[PDB]
Amino acid sequence: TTFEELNTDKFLRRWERERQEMLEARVKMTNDNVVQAMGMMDQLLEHM
Amino acid sequence: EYKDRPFLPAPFILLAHVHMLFMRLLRLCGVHTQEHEKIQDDETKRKITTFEELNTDKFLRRWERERQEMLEARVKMTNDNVVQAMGMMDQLLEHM
Amino acid sequence: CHGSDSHMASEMLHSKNDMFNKKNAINIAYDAKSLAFLSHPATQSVIN
Amino acid sequence: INALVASRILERLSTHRALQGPHLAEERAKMQHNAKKFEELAVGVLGECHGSDSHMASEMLHSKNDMFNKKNAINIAYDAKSLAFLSHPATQSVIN
Amino acid sequence: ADWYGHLKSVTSFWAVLFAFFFPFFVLPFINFSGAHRLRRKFAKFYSAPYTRFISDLLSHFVLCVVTSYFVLDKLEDTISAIEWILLVWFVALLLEELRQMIFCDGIAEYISDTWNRLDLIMITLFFVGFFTHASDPSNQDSKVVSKGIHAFLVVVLWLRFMR
Amino acid sequence: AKTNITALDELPSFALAIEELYKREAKKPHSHVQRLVSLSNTDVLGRHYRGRDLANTRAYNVLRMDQIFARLVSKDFSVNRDFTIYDSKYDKVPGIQFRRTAQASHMLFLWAICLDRFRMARHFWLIGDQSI
Amino acid sequence: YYALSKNLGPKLIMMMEMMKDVSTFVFLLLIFLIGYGVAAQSLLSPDEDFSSRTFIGVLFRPYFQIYGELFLDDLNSEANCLGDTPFTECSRETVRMVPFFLAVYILGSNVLLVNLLIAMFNDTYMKVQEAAEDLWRKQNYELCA
């Protein structure tokens, strides 16, 4: 039972890491990050 | 093809042929009968029309969402966003 | 499971489960018609 | 020669009696993977040599090595069962 | 859904064929997706395109088997009963082809289809062979030439069965 | 409301809560949960035998749903439930806090498979045990 | 007992899969065979009462002619043609069309249908070989159980 739960958590961590190393996810992550980056620049320009 | 064909098989289709000829003769010369059909109500037509327009808009929204989730569009969008980001930094540096 | 400890994974696949009527997991998989599970190398190793 | 020897040792260790066991599976997999990588390195360096000076590369492949018991590198590659190295155009040109 | 008409979609080839052969024994015990019941089931089941297709198949299959028997068995010194049945059958087929010519989308649309071409060649071959036999029924040579034309008739009939 | 059946009265509060989640989903028009329960042809305890008030007011109890899912898997599914462990007399037992969680999780997971909500199914699958 | 083997077992599952393509080939060939058999049997014997031998004549040579046994000496002898060149100087001129009918038939059956069956087998093979391996792995448990 302990072995099965540990390997279930281990597979989910490996699966999550593998899905984050895909090209589609990285391009999507990069796009959302640049959008949030301009939000932060909207704060810079306001303050300036 | 099989909707308009008479049901009676090949040897016995002569009876069907003379029956259709009898109907044509009795409608052209005799004129003792006519043709009857059914016409759909306006309510079900506007229901079909409303359904078709709603599904057209729904497909276009789904199609637009699907085209924005493609890799090429996302890379293009990311490129234009970084270009606009430097434009905003040209304003920061100017002001600074 | 098969990556971490193959023998313990074999013990896990051979364990009769009190819930589920004391059927081993391979019996469950065959009854569920899971072709992908049965064709896996770990399951095939236990069957061999 | 060291990359070929490295590929051979990892390949022989991956099927050796000391590495069989339930807990050693990933280790074994890693060995085969690393072996393959070293084989690629041996091919790559060889290719670079043949690109720079083919005749000097031929002299290099024909050189008996004092360490390694005076066997030429092609003899080492055949003994290491490196199919990728033997199928390379540089090695085949030296054999021809 | 148009193919099966007012019948359920789970109906198989054998069920519809059995219902076609046994009308009074399979129709009450069937699901349709007294004067008000029996007449309605008869008018709905036999107006379906699937039933008409099955009737045309079975009819063409009997035509092939009966015409095959006629060309294998020897011709008599007069026009036989099976010859008269086939004569009535092919006139009917010719009238059906003429009806198809009138109610299609032009002569070009009908002649584009290869099965219509096979139908015309089929009807033409039978009538040449029959008139060849019927010109001199007691002549042995006429019977031989008629069966020679009717060999071509049988091959086309079986080719036409692939529709 | 109080029930004459001893099996239904033995059920804890969270079982009634899962029954409430089934009831809310079932009251929607053309809902497949209601159709599944009606076409199952079973009584209140889920036995295949095909008291009208008891058969409609408590038609979505967890035992009956367990029997319906059991018939969906195979001919010999029989999930073993132990609702006695949720009583206060078993608090001194060491590993019971895992077990009480796990079983509960399982029941909710079955509900999440029934409504085809994959994310909650994956979450309750992760919380409980016997993953494979 | 071939199913235990890693080579013979999946191939047996694939053979059972190819039986549908074989059945498709049989349905297509029945047309050409019956059409040619009734026509050819009628041309060879045009003045004979129908019997069981007529039916046997309709199926025997056409079916075996798809396997290269052409029966040309037997067909020539049955046609009552006495010339040195085959199917010449015959009593009836219609029976001289038998080699032609045959000429169409083996073009239809061997050249067209058999090669089409080879194409269906190759496509079917590429589509369902991995599924056969998976089904063999399930049958491994079935045999073990």
Added chain:
Amino acid sequence: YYALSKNLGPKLIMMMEMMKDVSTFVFLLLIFLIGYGVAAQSLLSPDEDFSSRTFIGVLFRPYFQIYGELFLDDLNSEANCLGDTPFTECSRETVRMVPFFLAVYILGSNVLLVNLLIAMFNDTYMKVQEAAEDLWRKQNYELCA
């Protein structure tokens, strides 16, 4: 000495690879051949003591019938059927089933198994042609050494 050539050498390595598929075909055919051979030999001679000739009769015609030599004149003569139409007017009615058994057998062997072998050869060819080229390049050094 064909191995030196860039065309004949890899093809010889591939031929040695296809021998396993040939062996698979042989194992599948043995079933149909023995079943049909014992059955057909028994139908042709049902009142004969077993000898070495019975065993030779079980293997000779079935194996050679997979290559188009059907032996129908020889089978018809052996069946003691005196009719003009083949396998009619026989002494025993059971021997008239030989053409049918044969009809199943060559459907099993030529139509099904041979075409399956063509599919296995094509798949096997596409899978291991590059490996054969690599193995030929290693054998080039072996021959040079």
